[PDB]
């Protein structure tokens, strides 16, 4: 029976434990004999599985932590809306979106930092923003700072509601483990209620607010002259002017005469010629169809009324001759381990973020986002980074599950056991494929560099020489170009003009034009494959060898996160799943850096640009990608050296902050190498000398100073490495794109 059961007043709200750091942990509650205690407090703050053996306690803590996170996110959103309402040039941008640069942040004039308040436009000077909030609001139909103030108020109220809910559901009414372990009910409610009703409500909002307001805005009406959303809601005649099918009502809906709504529910495709974004009348239909799909999908599982599926039955029924027992035990694993669920959900969320980055650039969804090149680049790279981090976290928590919550008794001759029983084949084959891809993807660049340096330019892998044409990608592009009318008969235009078609231009500037793939694109795609495969190798190898290996037969006893197992067996450094995550994070950084560089150069060289009166488009770099992106020297000179000019010549401008952050990110990246190339013994001995100096003056801390643990040194090195690298790319990208757009 799916039912609600809670414990009343399980934990008393009191500050007694606020003054007892480490209370959650038995080893830490004693006190800080050394400085390692301080670091352990933070490393084990949110490891609820190591505080108690009670799954109920862990689940309640997780529920309340989620409520706190939602309150933080709502506060973030309310802050963004309030800054848009008070410290922005949103009205001027609405008046002339193609001339004034969006800005919603202003700095104080203290030490000359007021230079960062650049001339964005609209009589306003602030910090140009690249998050796309202006376009989000324009699509939502917001035309005033009053509406943004009300948005901020709603965000603040929801943040308060979420924090109250977290406190209430930890200290007043904490649900029980039987409540938590309702996968069928939770999936039904999420799918139908959360997703389906969310997209249904958004479709209603688009049909009643966004569509007419944006129709008038594209018609050129002034934001002040556009009527209000409640006017549209209550005046069916006013709406029936813009969309003449509202005079028909909901009778077509309930009689299945849905064609009557083709005026505002259509499958046009392409991009709005005025704004350069997707048709909001297409987005409304998209969200309505998604609502139907999700509400139907949320009726699949059994809750209380017999109708539905049991995922245990499905999984146990899915087995074959190559898999023995198949998916047996997985339902229990997933309703008894939060780490397995976290790994699955993180992998899916990161992959979704990557998919979102690709689609949101090729099919600009918001009005006036496509010609806002800083926004496009920033969003693409941002979501790429989020996806990479989520994937690495998925690997980490898969390893944590394998070490902590994996029980061989419950997993016998199922898929998990069989994977562990042939892990050597998997890793050896992935090793071979990684080496093959590395060779035949990077040695090609090396071959080209050597041939261009030797003057044998006819021996290179180039479009003007030996060719490596991505015929399959070009074939798919041709399919998608010709689909309108043939394989998608009732669509007027292609899904994206990147596959092919006519240039979409807004404000004498390209919004989206065909993206042509050649030898350089073939090369960079195979390098992307290489990097993804190597990252997968590192992460999967760590996960599979988390518990045991030929080297360390008892590794689950050492744990998921241990430094080593000593200098024996030749040396057993970094042999833990945690260290696999550490190296795989390095490699994820490599992969995403190459991906975002590919995006930046390709889009600045073959998509983005200004279109002349001759209908010809001149790009930001002008075709340098086809003949330069085939050599590492080409990348070093025509991309890094060439495009770093904007950020290195930003002093004295409003991008001087980008220049300074460029240098500081370089500093942090280099500073990471001190932790990464070094070990703990040297720093402990240096601390011994420094402590002698302190003792010579008859004083020294009661908390004995210690060098960072081996794992913590690796973690600090990795964190500084990632911060420095990503910050360098951040400053470089933003300075370049805000200078040339």
């Amino acid at each position: 029976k799916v039912s609600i059961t809670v414990d009343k007043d399980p934990v008393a709200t009191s500050f007694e434990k606020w003054a007892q750091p480490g209370h959650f942990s038995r080893t830490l509650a004693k006190g800080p004999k050394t400085t390692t205690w301080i670091w352990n407090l933070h490393a084990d703050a949110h490891d609820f599985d190591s505080h108690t053996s009670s799954l109920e306690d862990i689940s309640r803590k997780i529920f309340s932590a989620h409520f706190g996170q939602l309150s933080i996110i709502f506060l973030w959103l309310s802050g963004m809306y309030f800054h848009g309402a008070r410290f922005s040039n949103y009205s001027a941008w609405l008046s002339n979106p193609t001339a004034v640069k969006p800005s919603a942040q202003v700095v104080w004039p203290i030490v000359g930092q007021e230079v960062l308040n650049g001339d964005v436009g609209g009589g306003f000077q602030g910090v140009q923003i690249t998050s796309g909030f202006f376009q989000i609001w324009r699509a939502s139909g917001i035309t005033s700072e009053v509406e943004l103030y009300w948005c901020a108020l709603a965000g603040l109220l929801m943040s308060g509601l979420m924090i109250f809910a977290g406190w209430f559901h930890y200290h007043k009414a904490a649900p029980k483990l039987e409540w938590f372990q309702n996968a069928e009910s939770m999936l039904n409610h999420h799918l139908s209620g959360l997703l389906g009703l969310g997209c249904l409500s958004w479709a209603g909002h688009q049909i009643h607010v966004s569509l007419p307001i944006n129709k008038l805005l594209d018609a050129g009406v002034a934001p002040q002259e556009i009527p209000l959303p409640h006017e549209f809601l209550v005046n069916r005649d006013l709406m029936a002017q813009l969309y003449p099918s509202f005079s028909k009502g909901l009778v077509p809906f309930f009689t299945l005469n849905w064609s009557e709504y083709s005026d505002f529910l259509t499958f046009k495709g392409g991009l709005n010629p005025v704004t350069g974004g997707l048709w909001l009348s297409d987005t409304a239909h998209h969200h309505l169809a998604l609502a139907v799909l999700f509400i139907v999908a949320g009726h699949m599982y059994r809750t209380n009324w017999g109708i539905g599926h049991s995922m245990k039955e499905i999984l146990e029924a899915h087995k074959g001759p190559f898999t023995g027992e198949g998916h047996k035990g997985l339902y229990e694993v997933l309703i008894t381990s939060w780490h397995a669920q976290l790994s699955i959900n993180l992998a899916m969320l990161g992959s979704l973020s990557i998919i979102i980055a690709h689609h949101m650039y090729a099919m600009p969804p918001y009005p006036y986002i496509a010609t806002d090149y800083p926004t496009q680049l920033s969003l693409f790279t941002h979501h790429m980074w989020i996806g990479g981090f989520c994937v690495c976290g998925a690997a980490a928590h898969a390893g944590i599950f394998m070490v902590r919550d994996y029980n061989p008794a419950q997993n016998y001759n199922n898929l998990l056991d069989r994977v562990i029983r042939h892990r050597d084949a998997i890793i050896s084959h992935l090793n071979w494929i990684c080496i093959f891809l590395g060779f035949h993807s990077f040695g090609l660049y090396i071959h080209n560099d050597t041939m261009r340096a030797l003057g044998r330019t006819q021996d290179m892998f180039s479009d003007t020489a030996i060719q490596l044409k991505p015929v399959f990608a070009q074939w798919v592009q041709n399919i998608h170009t010709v689909a309108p009318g043939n394989t998608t008969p009732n669509a007027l235009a292609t899904a994206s003009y990147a596959f092919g078609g006519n240039v979409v231009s807004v404000g004498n500037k390209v919004a989206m034009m065909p993206i042509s793939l050649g030898t350089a694109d073939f090369m960079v795609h195979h390098i992307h494959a290489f990097t993804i495969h190597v990252t997968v190798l590192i992460l999967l190898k760590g996960v599979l060898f988390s518990r045991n290996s030929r080297l360390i037969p008892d590794k689950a006893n050492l744990g998921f996160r241990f430094p080593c197992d000593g200098p024996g067996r030749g040396g057993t450094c970094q042999s833990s799943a945690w260290d696999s995550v550490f190296l795989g994070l390095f490699w994820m950084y490599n992969c995403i850096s190459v991906v975002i560089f590919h995006f930046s150069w390709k889009m600045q060289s073959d998509v983005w640009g200004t279109v002349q009166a001759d209908n010809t488009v001149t790009h930001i770099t002008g075709g340098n990608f086809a003949q330069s992106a085939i050599t590492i020297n080409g990348w070093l000179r025509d991309f890094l050296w060439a495009q770093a000019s904007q950020v290195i010549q930003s002093y004295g401008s409003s991008l001087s902050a980008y220049g300074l952050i460029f240098l500081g990110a370089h500093f942090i990246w280099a500073f990471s190498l001190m932790f990464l190339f070094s070990g703990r013994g040297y720093w402990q001995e240096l601390i011994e000398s420094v402590v002698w100096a302190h003792n010579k003056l008859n004083f020294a801390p009661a908390i004995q100073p210690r060098a960072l643990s081996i794992t913590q040194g690796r973690a600090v090195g990795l964190a500084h490495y990632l911060l420095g690298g990503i910050g360098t790319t951040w400053a470089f990208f933003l300075a370049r794109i805000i200078s040339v757009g």
Binding site: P321, D459, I466
Partner: protein, 150 residues
Amino acid sequence: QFVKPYNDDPFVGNLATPVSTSSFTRSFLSNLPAYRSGLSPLLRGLEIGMTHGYFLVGPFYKLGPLRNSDVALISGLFSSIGLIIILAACLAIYGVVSFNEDDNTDSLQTSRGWKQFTSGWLVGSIGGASFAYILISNIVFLQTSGLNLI
């Protein structure tokens, strides 16, 4: 059902799988020269080298430095011969280093057996490279990869 212990030994570092222990796999492996029964190490080497020096001429012929020249095929054959000599040297040094002079009766895991294998491999490889050179030089379809029919 399909995946089982190797040789009914659950603790050997192997699994019996369709790719590893199917009837087609076993027949193919047992009929390859490296495993066929009755062949001398010399005949094994002969067949293997014949097969290898043939494919070697093409990559060199069609992608080598002198591929757009009138001496592309001869250059290719020559470069195959050089690589064959290098690999024969590798085989010889491997034989002298790995196998000691005890006599196991030419089982391909003996000094004499490996010497015969490397000699046969050299002869067969050079012969196969020459055969491929002759066929390419004399047949247009091979010089154009079929772009004579266009």
